[PDB]
Symmetry: C5
Subunit: 281 residues, 5 copies
């Protein structure tokens, strides 16, 4: 039960690095950090699709200053997210036409530029007072996924647990396939969406442009804010004094020269969130 | 100028509409293609019968609201009035996939590249009303051959207009007799039926179409946007029989088959949240 | 134009006039399309009216307002707003179009090319026929000479010598007409005249090319206000409301010669009117 | 020094015919009036680029009613342009797929449509109280231009007069390369832009979409006007009682069947300008 | 500490300037002079089979404008600063992008034809900024191990010149490396493919940018003298000019030229005009 604002503010900022699959600059895949592993047409059919091949949501919880010295009291204060500025950094890097290992965009006897990053763009950011609610889906119900222990990603049927002969249901809406975005680099974009049936205490904003050769269209400015207040003037209220931020920013794909397969490329996203104190019952 | 760098009165209803692209249930022989259409080829409907499973259809539902009037003969009645709605197509991220089962490879013949992703025609419409959505029929080709099914799995404009087969070219324009109510889920093909702008006084509908086979799908998703359903007089749809009627169609593109380059449509589920209030009206 | 004085709503459909303008005769199966167009038509043959999409138009008789037309102060119907919609947009998803080119390799069994390419969409509401200005993309295009005429061309009015018809590639002031006949004025030769049309409102868009994705919307929640900057809408002379449109939604490509047909769709109109006293 | 309005009005109409290169329906090139001459990749390198090959700005001066009985008076009247309606006519003609001499858009054994007009669109219009100020540039500083006595067009270096070895400066910003749009069909669009460093007494509006196969996107209506007043509510003031209108409307190109070279196509533009009387010092 | 605006008849001023593009060939002199306003040629394996040169990497343009001196004594506890209120800015020369007779450019036609050249098209990168101090930049690498030429003196500066990561850790620059930060303090020096405006700083600047990628994308550009950008923030305060300096910067890649003989590319940029309106604002010192 939301009461009146207490007149008292604070701002937090943070960066979320992309989780395109290669999620750390370490090991033998280090050079491909910020990209996915290679994806081929029959992957997941004639082999297991790996987590490194599946771009994932980024997320973090920011701890806010503690508000109530006694959690038993009938009236308490909560942090309320009022507005946010957010930005995808590094967009100029997408002009490169000398991408390592990338297909040449010219005739077979030429010496032209590489294909630049282009194709599918999927951009979403969210700010909320608790983890983002996710709804699960499968483009192909019977896609084969790797089983690592511990798991490196989670899939809708890990939660829905349909019998294998019923997994075609996941190509529609399966209500049991729901989860919270509670782990960075774990929930694949191609299987999980913000759940519009929940998320009463979060705000999310997403866009998608598909295809493999589509020009990426991105903007950057520090002159624009997003107001997080709902129709009643109430922003997300931060349970446990935690602010939750999430995003995904697939900016396109790289095409490999030797087999023409692809890797996704993502870019880091900045957040600046402005909060105020709100009394609640 | 120099060059300077020179060197209970209200209620909320929620529901999901699953897509009806043709394969309309994860059952039977076609179970694995639920949420897609059946395969379509250029001569289908000419050198064979076009099947209902090959024709994406409108989704629709009626939600029973709390009953408002004990005596429906009173000259002043209460009705539910739809004021606004939030709606969203879910699963958009799934459209990034370039490992689509049976799909054509987007690369040279000696390569091992990605599959073609879902792309091409996008047809998106949602509607909220106090009675079934009014539909007007049309045909792109008047003489298209349609399968005869018992029980029938779709209905076509000429099942209503009942024109002689030799006059069916009329259906390529506007045939006033070819009208229907969106009264059955997964039954009215998108390619034959549109919202009827000459009726639908008690419904609101919103549609967009981008054609072509290789067009990049362009879709948005957010929980911070609502659609106001009130008309110019401040009146929203009024729910007859205390029923709220929601409808949609969301073709998100096509898949291209590797073995013959024919296509299947792909659709995605749509969520609705409708906010309603009560209005007294003359009876 | 005096003050307003009560209201009424007019509805109608305009069926497309793409060339094959009736579901009768020998071409009846292509009603709502143009006849086939090839690159050299109008050069090594005569371009037919059935090959040239045309404006649709109608005059709706409104309730008579004045007992005596002699009076110095009369009532006129004033068009205030309108809702308009292109119906049948969903039919443009078809990839099983009769006689259409296959969009796949020569060894495949793929879909047909769908309707796509150039879109030309215009609607107008006025108190008198829409004024048109004529033009030619090619001054010397050869047009058939039917009796009676099935279409009218700019030089039919301007009557320039054959050696001067290159003028029609620019602006010929003599090449003016009124949109007074349905399925008669070709879109490729006639445009709404911005130097006239004081008593009409028109709204048009064009996206060219042969393979362009068609981009259309449909909704019953949007209206167009027809009032001008003085708050005055079109005034219906002779108690007649004049509506006109053209909606080329793209082209079909034929499998056997790769030539094209334009495709059009019907348009709906709902016009709201009020009574206005005039001098 | 601008003073108050004098409360008196007038409306001016005119058409500007396109000047794509073939600027009159006369002479040897008369049948291509409203188009450019044919342009090939090496034109201006292994030959001289001709004025007929370079689309130019259209412009006109409209004489307004004389306002002042005596131009020596300390307070005078000027016509002030307040708003304007403008329209490109003939857009429907761009649907044509039977264009004379044009490449066929089908396989070589077919009998399909011609390529329609498509590709780069350059649309600008301007209304001012004096000629539009232009700034010059060259995409290639060493482009070879024909010499006619008298000249049929004027180029930036005709004004800047840089040594031949210095003409690469014209690929950037050369302040000496300035001109007034004082002659119809004379200033090529590819060499001359509205000068944002001047033009205090004009308003111009321009858009460009490039490429050779881009779908042309054009609108037409009589329900929209452009307001010409500046931030202080002052429109262009007509010096010498002359109103100056300018434009360029490249709507795309035609592709010739026999060599695949191109001609630009333009369309005429209509103007309706509304003016009022303003007192000035 | 921002105080109130100081009203008066001489309280505002206006500044105009041009910035020429820095696509790589940054002066019309020397051996590369005929390609001024373009980049040097770029090929797929450059930076791998060879060193990527500064002339191959478009850079931000920038300038500091000296404003009228405001405070005779910078000792005083209360001072005045120029406050940037609005800006008009325009990319000039857009009409030149219609050319289909580009020197050395690939022919857009069949192999035995005589058609037009490919016009400038492809990726467009447009940004402008106005601030009261240099624009803050954040570094990144699309490929951490890209090979760069090391000239003495340096012709450009790269994110790891500042971050100084070990060579085997440079993959970190493909994400967000907080030490990879710089100020846009030198014209024709910071490549756009390695440096973006830093959204974590730039409190005293305003920047506006767009990108449309790909190699064949139609350039889409507007020009008009009837539109301004308001520079005031949510509290109505514009950038405040430290040391009486106005800082402007930009980058305008309008597309690429494709060479006929190897199909490699050069970027093309165009010059940008600025008109900045400023007013006097009192601040606490
Ligand atoms: C998850 C992962 O490590 N993916 C890598 C894949 C897989 O290991 C591979 O596809 C499994 O079969 O391999 C990638 O590299 C391959 C690519 O360079 C292709 C180009 O044709 O060549 C492959 O190796 C060939 C080898 O050249 C032949 O001699 C023969 O032995 O067959 C092998 C395997 O086909 C490379 O492994 C890929 O891009 O697919 C790199 C991925 O990181
Ligand atoms: C206005 C009209 O009726 N147009 C129809 C045209 C014309 O009759 C024709 O183009 C005039 O020359 O014809 C269309 O049908 C033609 C198409 O099927 C092509 C495919 O190659 O074949 C044509 O017939 C050939 C015939 O096959 C040859 O044996 C020989 O007789 O020549 C004729 C004409 O070239 C069809 O006429 C068309 O698409 O052009 C149908 C139009 O409705
Ligand atoms: C400014 C002008 O008049 N341009 C015309 C050009 C030039 O006269 C020409 O390009 C200068 O060399 O010519 C155009 O017409 C040419 C075109 O039809 C090509 C098609 O291949 O043929 C040319 O003539 C050829 C002839 O066919 C050959 O047999 C041989 O004689 O060589 C000549 C010259 O190449 C036409 O001149 C053109 O489009 O380039 C028409 C322009 O209006
Ligand atoms: C409604 C439905 O079930 N659609 C099927 C269609 C139809 O059954 C078929 O098109 C009717 O002719 O078949 C689909 O599969 C076909 C496809 O794999 C093609 C690939 O070239 O092969 C077809 O089979 C051939 C077979 O290869 C030959 O040995 C045989 O002599 O002829 C067969 C029939 O053509 C497959 O049936 C299709 O995509 O068209 C699958 C759809 O779900
Ligand atoms: C930074 C710079 O000056 N770049 C040049 C480049 C480089 O000098 C070159 O790529 C280094 O290998 O050269 C450019 O021109 C080349 C281009 O014209 C190609 C066309 O095939 O030919 C190259 O020279 C060839 C020569 O023709 C061969 O006979 C010889 O055996 O090898 C030479 C090197 O490949 C030109 O150098 C280029 O566009 O790459 C011009 C740039 O300004
Ligand atoms: Mg809910
Ligand atoms: Mg009605
Ligand atoms: Mg007039
Ligand atoms: Mg100035
Ligand atoms: Mg900060």
């Amino acid at each position: 039960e939301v009461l009146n604002i207490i007149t008292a503010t604070t701002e937090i900022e943070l960066w979320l690095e992309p989780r395109m699959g290669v999620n750390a600059p370490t090991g033998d895949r280090k050079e491909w950090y910020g990209y996915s592993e290679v994806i081929h047409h029959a992957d997941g059919y004639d082999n297991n699709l790996l987590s490194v091949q599946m771009p994932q949501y980024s997320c973090a919880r920011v701890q806010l200053p503690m508000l109530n010295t006694d959690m038993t009291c009938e009236t308490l204060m909560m942090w309320e997210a009022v507005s946010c500025k957010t930005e995808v950094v590094g967009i100029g890097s997408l002009i490169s036409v000398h991408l390592l290992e990338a297909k040449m965009e010219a005739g077979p006897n030429s010496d032209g530029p590489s294909r630049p990053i282009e194709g599918m763009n999927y951009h979403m950011f969210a700010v909320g007072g608790e983890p983002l609610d996710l709804q699960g889906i499968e483009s192909n119900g019977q896609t084969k996924y790797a089983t690592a222990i511990p798991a490196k990603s989670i899939h809708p049927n890990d939660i829905a647990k349909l019998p294998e002969e019923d997994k075609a249901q996941l190509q529609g809406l399966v209500p049991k396939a729901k989860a919270k975005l509670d782990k960075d680099g774990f929930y694949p974009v191609e299987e999980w969406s913000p759940d519009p049936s929940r998320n009463e205490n979060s705000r999310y904003y997403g866009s998608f442009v598909g295809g493999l050769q589509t020009p990426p269209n991105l903007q950057f400015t520090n002159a624009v804010s997003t107001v997080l207040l709902d129709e009643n003037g109430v922003g997300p209220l931060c349970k446990g004094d935690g602010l939750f931020v999430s995003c995904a920013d697939i900016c396109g794909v790289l095409v490999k020269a030797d087999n023409e397969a692809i890797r996704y490329r993502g870019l880091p996203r900045y957040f600046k969130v402005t909060l105020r104190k709100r009394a609640v019952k």
